Amino acid sequence: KRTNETLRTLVADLRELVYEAEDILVDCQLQYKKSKRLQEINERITKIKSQVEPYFEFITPDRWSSPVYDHTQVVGLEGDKRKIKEWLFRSNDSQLLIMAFVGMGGLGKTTIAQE
Amino acid sequence: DKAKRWFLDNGSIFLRELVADCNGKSIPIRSFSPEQILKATNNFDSSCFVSQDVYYKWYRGEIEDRSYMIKRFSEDEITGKRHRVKEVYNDIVLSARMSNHSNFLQLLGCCLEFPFPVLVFEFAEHGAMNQRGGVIVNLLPWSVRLKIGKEIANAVTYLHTAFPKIIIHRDVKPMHVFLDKNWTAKLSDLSFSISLPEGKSRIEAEWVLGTFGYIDPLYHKTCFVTEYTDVYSFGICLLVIITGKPAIMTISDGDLQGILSLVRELCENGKLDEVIDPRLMKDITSGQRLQVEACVVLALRCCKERDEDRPKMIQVAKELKQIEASL
Amino acid sequence: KEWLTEVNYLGQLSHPNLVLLVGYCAEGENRLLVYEFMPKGSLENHLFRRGAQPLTWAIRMKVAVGAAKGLTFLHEAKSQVIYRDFKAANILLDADFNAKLSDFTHVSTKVIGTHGYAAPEYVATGRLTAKSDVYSFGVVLLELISGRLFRIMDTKLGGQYPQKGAFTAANLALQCLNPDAKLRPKMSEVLVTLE
Amino acid sequence: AKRVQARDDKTHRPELLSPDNSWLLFCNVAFAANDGTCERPELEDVGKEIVTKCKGLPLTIKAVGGLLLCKDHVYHEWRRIAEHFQDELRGNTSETDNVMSSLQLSYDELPSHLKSCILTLSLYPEDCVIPKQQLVHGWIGEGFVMWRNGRSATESGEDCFSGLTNRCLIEVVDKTYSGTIITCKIHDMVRDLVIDIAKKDSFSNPEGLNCRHLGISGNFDEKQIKVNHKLRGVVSTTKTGEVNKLNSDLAKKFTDCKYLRVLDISKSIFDAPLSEILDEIASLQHLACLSLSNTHPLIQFPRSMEDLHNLQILDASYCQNLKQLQPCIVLFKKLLVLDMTNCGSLECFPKGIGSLVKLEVLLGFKPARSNNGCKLSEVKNLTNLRKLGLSLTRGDQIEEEELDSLINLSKLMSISINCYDSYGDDLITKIDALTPPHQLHELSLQFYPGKSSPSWLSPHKLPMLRYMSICSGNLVKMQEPFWGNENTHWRIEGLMLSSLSDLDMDWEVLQQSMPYLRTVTANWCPELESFAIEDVGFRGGVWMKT
Amino acid sequence: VTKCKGLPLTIKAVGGLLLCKDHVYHEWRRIAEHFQDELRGNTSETDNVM
Amino acid sequence: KIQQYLLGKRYLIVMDDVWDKNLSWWDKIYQGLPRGQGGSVIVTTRSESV
Ligand SMILES: Nc1ncnc2c1ncn2[C@H]1C[C@H](O)[C@@H](COP(=O)(O)OP(=O)(O)OP(=O)(O)O)O1
Incomplete structure (x- = not known):
């Protein structure tokens, strides 16, 4: 994580190189035309490495949550809140009651727990 | 022939509504030949007809080892309208979709080199019921x-x-x-x-x-x-x-x-x-x-x-x- | 084939409450029947439009008497002509407020009677009659009463009384709208009992 | 949730917001100047249209209200945002609110094969309902799924699909009775995210030229969607009911690539038969999968298939005129899936079907007549398949001493028997000779012209059956071994009885024969009326016992 | 369990990867023939006997 | 903690030299401040965007 822009452009360029490299590589199984294709793609890879590298030689180089919220914007969750409260009132009926709030990102899970 | 044309449009017409009906998931339709329908209907001119209506004719027939019940259409009517031909396509597609329920008459395929399709169904020796009863040579309890x-x-x-x-x-x-x-x-x-x-x-x-x-x-x-x-x-x-x-x-x-x-x-x-x-x-x-x-x-x-x-x-x-x- | 026949079918047209022999064409295609103009439109262009005209007194009753005269023209004088096409849009008007009718086995698509014009026996059987004609004329009379012994079926004049045409028209409609083929109207009594 | 093993009924899934509640939230965020009330009534249709573009996520609603709260309420830029919605939410006001970051942190924690699997889903229309099976054959097509330990193709890719649904990146449209998934869709913010990650490396351009693999939405007969030379895959993405009409010259362009591993043509109509359209598919070399399902002019697939030595998946289902399958498929010995379901006119196979051994799925088999096609005897060869579909028509389709052709299939999990076009009564006697393997997870007799049971359906003959469906047919009663309640019981957990007019069985007798049930879905069985369904007649219930 | 041969740690690892499973017979059979390969995959390196 | 220490008090708080980058922290703590008490925030800044 925490990557600069040169790394992003280099990654985006090496993916295109990977695709065309394993694209032409499959034609292994005259040798003249395939040998010059190998020459061109090897020399382009080496050239890109050589001219990217000094830019890396030049320079050298969270998410949290809490039970504090507002409870005025919280658009009605009284049914889910009710159901989860009647789940929590049955806590002693097991040995250790564990519950799960499963959903996609930004759907209400932390806020329904805070509620 | 021009019959290939009768392939290459009609089924294509056909295709773009059963995909519109069932999203393509349907019953195993059989594709027959021209000559078997001309043979089993005996060139469609006999007393093997079951019944009639405005746009279609119900006949009996016999392709090899199984007698069948064949439906065919009228050329001039469906070529003389240009807009109620979708009723024929609704008929073939819905008669495909209802064919799994028991109290409907199942569909056993389609040959379509003809005017527009010609349809085939399994055999039922008790014929179509008349305006009062059975059209057997004679009577039901x-x-x-x-x-x-x-x-x-x-x-x-x-x-x-x-x-x-x-x-x-x-x-x-x-x-x-x-x-x-x-x-x-x-x-x-x-x-x-x-x-x-x-x-x-x-x-x-x-x-x-x-x-x-x-x-x-x-x-x-x-x-x-x-x-x-x-x-x-x-x-x-x-x-x-x-x-x-x-x-x-x-x-x-x-x-x-x-x-x-x-x-x-x-x-x-x-x-x-x-x-x-x-x-x-x-x-x-x-x-x-x-x-x-x-x-x-x-x-x-x-x-x-x-x-x-x-x-x-x-x-x-x-x-x-x-x-x-x-x- | 198609010419001397159609002239024989169309040549019998001499009646005042109808459309005469104004014109025709050379009709290599279907019917190009040319019959010129009707100025003020139909009943529905005055009854069922809120744009132009409110009610009057019983001049529409004279329109219905004149169309009932047209019925007695084509049912009595000519031995066999049946309209089959009773609509308020088929009833056309003049500046004189007079009716002139125009716009003329088992076949699937029904056209006649998208509303209550069609006879119940014509529904159940398809017999194509003068009994359907008098039932349809009765419900046209009901449309003239309606616009849609306490008979205030009007919504714009509560003074239906002084000519007593409302009671007579409603009772003749009670005679028209009976379901069988045995209590059926005849149109000359409808002529004389509405004047 | 399972790794903590919460419970099945202690999970909670919060739903997307109702439109009224979402409008309340968007007023409470954007119009915060007074009370969360809309202070001018000409911005209201614009706001409601933007809110319908949000589709129930609270987070996108609060992000849109955040970028509109920095705005002077002029109608024109509100209209602007109402047409350029996802572009501003991927600018994120130079990355402040960042919907895309919170979703992308659920993207980027994937195994890299699941990354390549989830990226191919950026190649679909707005809210189309995607079939699972086509995605799985696509993934096996490019080799996004690898295998060694026996779990070769279908279970491995299905494990990939279930791994994507477990990450809450894919929403399941509808199951079956047996719990298995057929159709799939994704949320639209996730769709924009995966497009933008494809808008990187040349996976999908989708405009212009540089594209590793392309998808065709509806009616490119007059657009000329452009195909360059790279094109590792071409799929056809149709929004559940319309047919992608295709020109003949574009199909001529489809044989002009060299590196095309995936090619499926699904909702299509061509200007010519597909034989001479695809005469030069020998020029395609490294091709893995063909799904030629539901295309009209295909009478006969082209002859030049012998220059296809890889060919891992061959699908041609639901094409009602596929007469003569070619013997050249017996050559290459390296397919995995052969799928002819409901292919009506079909003369029932080439001979050496039991030659090629690696295949896992064989649907719509049609065993041959006497001196014809191929019989069931060599199916005993195939010790790797696990899904098998029969479709029986008359008595000499099968033979008596081939009754041992289904005992030794060790890895087999499912049998579907399709006795639709059934004639001979002897077939009813000849079907009873067949025995499934004693491991069998799920079977489906869907027409079956018999009257009694098939006289092997007993807990004795197959102990480990869990799922079972009987569709339409002429069945009357179940025989005595079908109950078999001296010490044996079924442990069938789910049951389906679709349209059986004459079926006679009893409810508590089923329960004393089938102790471990969850659901029973019957919907057209007017004989029964003893069940706990709200009517066993004209509609269907499920009977979830608890 | 006889393939585990008495180590408690391999037993708990195999029970850990079977506890994420729906008790269908077929993959239990699968694990009963491909034992060490799954335990060197370690569900992408979670239980990690190795 | 800050919900407790500021509860029931008339609090003044001066956020000095606030910039227009990564400002989301504001409405992570804006719900941390109690309301209806007379509390006042003074933000001094170089932007009328913020
Ligand atoms: N019912 C609601 N009323 C108002 N705001 C809501 C509601 N549900 C969610 N929100 C807001 C709170 C946050 O600003 C935003 C994100 O929701 P939040 O609960 O934090 O995410 P989440 O828990 O669903 O997923 P994740 O924690 O993975 O991001 O949505």
Whole structure:
């Protein structure tokens, strides 16, 4: 994580190189035309490495949550809140009651727990 | 030939609506040849025809080792309209989709080098039921006719209820009904059955159509479709089950016998004394007259002129079921 | 084939409450029947439009008497001509407020009677009659009464009384709208009992 | 949730917001100047249209209200945002609110094969409903799924699919009775995210030229969607009901690539038969999968298939005119899936079907007649398949001493028998000779012209059956070994009885024969009426016992 | 369990990877023939006997 | 903690030299401040965007 822009452009360029490299590589199984294709793609890879590298030689180089919220914007969750409260009132009926709030990102899970 | 053209458009037309109907998931349709249909229909000019209508003809036939029942069309009618050809495509696609339910007549394939398709179905030696009965060389007992009634009720409830879109086959007539060796009725010919959109059993239609007497006068004078616009016609069908008479009739009387009017005036005045099937007077009818008058009361009840007076077709099938379950 | 026949079918047209032989074409295609003009439109262009005209007194009753005269023209004088096409849009008007009628086995698509014009026996059988004609004329009379012994079926004049045409028209409609083929109207009594 | 093993009924899934509640939230965020009330009534249709573009996520609603709260309420830029919605939410006001970051942190924690699997889903329309099977054959097509330990193709890719659904990146449209998934869709913010990650490396351009693999939405007969030379895959993405009409010259362009591993043509109509359209598919070399399902002019697939030595998946289902399958498929010995379901006119196979051994799925087999096609005897060869579909038509389709052709199939999990076009009564006697393997997870008799049971359906003959469905047919009663309640019981957990008019069995007798049930879905069985379904007649219930 | 041969740690690892499973017979059979390969995958390196 | 220490007090708080980058922290703590008490925030800044 925490990557600069040169790394992003280099990654985006090496993916295109990977695709065309394993694209032409499959034609292994005259040798003249395939040998010059190998020459061109090897020399382009080496050239890109050589001219990217000094830019890396030049320079050298969270998410949290809490039970504090507002409870005025919280658009009605009284049914889910009710159901989860009647789940929590049955806590002693097991040995250790564990519950799960499963959903996609930004759907209400932390806020329904805070509620 | 030009027959390849008959391939390369018609099926393509065909394709873009069953993908519109079932999203392509359907029944194993068989593709036949021209010459087998010209052979099994005996070049379509014999007495192997079952029956007729405006746009199509029902024939018998025999391809190798299995006799079949072949439906074909009329060229001039469907080439003379340019806009009601979608009814033919609705007919083939819905007759594919309903083919898994038992009280419908299954579909066994399609050859389509012809005018537009030519269709094939499995064999049913009891022919199509006439305006009064069997068109065998001759006559059915009352239990058999009541079985026919309950299964036609089942098939129309399958049309109304089994899908998120209500398809109302408004032209229910005994002429569309075939019968097996075991006298199990099987509907067919869904060519005028329109498909409503979902959630809406009441949407104004496009034109009133179909079969004097069975027309449901409510829709004839309101011109919007509900499911009751089939149910009325169904009861008249049951009266053909009951009486053994044609629906539209005359006895040297001006071509005028509304048989619905006759049976209701023999209810309120004649007191149910002439609904006792002179085709089948020699039957036992000991306690069977009880279920007979229950059938006549029900057939009048679903033919009542207002919608709320009429039961839902599900309930019609259910009280039919309790009527035959009394014995 | 198609010419001397159609002239024989169309040559019998001499009646005042109808459309005469104004014109025709050379009709290599279907019917190019050319019959010129009707100035003020139909009943529905005055009854069922809120744009132009409120009610009057019984001049529409004279329109209905004149169209009932047209009925007695084509039913009595000519032995066999049946209209089959009763609509309020088929009833056309003049500046004189007079009716002139124009715009003329089992076949699937129904056209006749999208509303209550069609006879119940024509519903149940398809017999194509003068009984349907008098039932349709009765419900046209009902449309003239309606616009849609306490008979205030009007919504714009509560003074139906002084000519007593409302009671007579409603009772003749009670005679018209009976369901069988045995209590049926005849149109000359409808002529004399509405004047 | 399972790794903690919470419980099945202690999980909680919060739903997307109702439109009224979402409008309340958007007023409470954007119009915060007074009370969360809309202070001018001409911005209201614009706001409601933007809110319908949000589709129930609270987070996108609060982000849109955040970028509109820095705005002077002029109608024009509100309209602007109402047409350029996802572009501003991927600018994120130079990355402040950042919907895309919170979703992308659920993207980027994937195994890299699941990354390549989830990226191919950026190639679909707005809210189309995607079939699972086509995604799985696509993933096996490019080799996004690898395998060694026996779990070769279908279970491995299905494990990939279930891994994507477990990450809450994919929403399941509808199951079956047996719990298995057929259709799939994704949320639209996730769709934009995966497009933008494809808008990186040349996976999908989707405009212009540089594209590793392309998808065709509806009716490119008049657009000329452009195909360059790279094109590792071409799929056809149709929004559940319309047919992608294709020109003949574009199909001529489809044989002009060299590196095309995936090619499926699904909702299509061509201007010519597909034989001479695809005469030069020998020029395609490294091709893995062909799904030629539901295409009209395909009478006969082209002859030049012998220059296809890889060919891992061959699908041609639901094409009602596929007459003569070619013997050249017996050559290459390296397929995994052969799928002919409901292919009506079909003369029932080339001979050496039991030659090639690596295949796992064989649907719509049609065993041959007497001196014809191929019989069931060599199916005993195939010791790796696990899904098998039969479709029987008459008596000499099968033979008596081939009754041992299904005992030894060790890895087999499912049998579907399709006795639709059934004629001979002897077939009813000849089917009873067949026995499934004693391990069998799920079977489906869907037409079956018999009257009694098939006289092997007993807990004795197959102990480990869990799922079972009987569709339409002429069945009357179940025989005595079908109950078999001396010490044996079924442990069938789910049951389906679709359209059986004459079926007679009893409810508490089923429960004393089938102790471990969850659901029973019957919907057209007017004989029964003894069940706990709301009607066993004209509609269907499920009977979830608890 | 006889393939585990008495180590508690391999037993708990195999029970850990079977506890994420729906008790269908077929993959239990699968694990009963491909034992060490799954325990060197370690569900992408979670239980990690190795 | 800050919900407790500021509860029931008339609090003044001066956020000095606030910039227009990564400002989301504001409405992570804006719900941490009690309301209806007379509390006042003074933000001094170089932007009328913020
Ligand atoms: N019912 C609601 N009313 C108002 N705001 C809501 C509601 N549900 C969620 N929100 C807001 C709170 C946050 O600003 C935003 C994100 O929701 P939040 O609960 O934090 O995410 P989440 O828990 O669903 O997923 P994750 O924690 O993975 O991001 O949505």
